[PDB]
Amino acid sequence: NPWGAESYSDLIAKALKSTFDGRMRLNEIYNWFASNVPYFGNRTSQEQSAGWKNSIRHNLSLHSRFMRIQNEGAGKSSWWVINPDAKPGRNPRRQRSATLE
């Protein structure tokens, strides 16, 4: 990992944690890293950041635990949140995964 031994999801969640109860903008997430991680503060330009953005985006598109929140608006203005049913602290009242036997 470019920042250290922390995992993407470790730091992604920390970023998201700054406004976790609502939404965090995908660009804010990048800004979080750039601000809190010195290495990323060195990578804020388009080509400087694109690769590590691709890394975050790669994981965002692999883990279904990350999900996009619907907002009616086109363009790059997208924002996403971590799936409440895939994060600890609060388990769903109704068991979606109840194991039907």
Domain that holds residue 27: 1-97
Contacts of residue 59, defined as CB under 8 A and 6 or more positions apart, other chains included, come to 8, 9, 12, 66
The number of folded domains in the chain is 1
CATH label of the domain that carries residue 32: 1.10.10.10
Contacts of residue 17, defined as CB under 8 A and 6 or more positions apart, other chains included, come to none
84 token code pair: 């409440």
Transcribe the chain into DSSP letters.
--S-SS-HHHHHHHHHTTSTTS-EEHHHHHHHHHHH-HHHHT--SHHHHHHHHHHHHHHHTT-TTEEEPP-S--SS--EEEE-GGGSTT---SS-SS----
Per the CB < 8 A criterion, the answer to whether 63 and 78 are in contact is no
Sign of CA dihedral 93, 95, 97, 99: positive
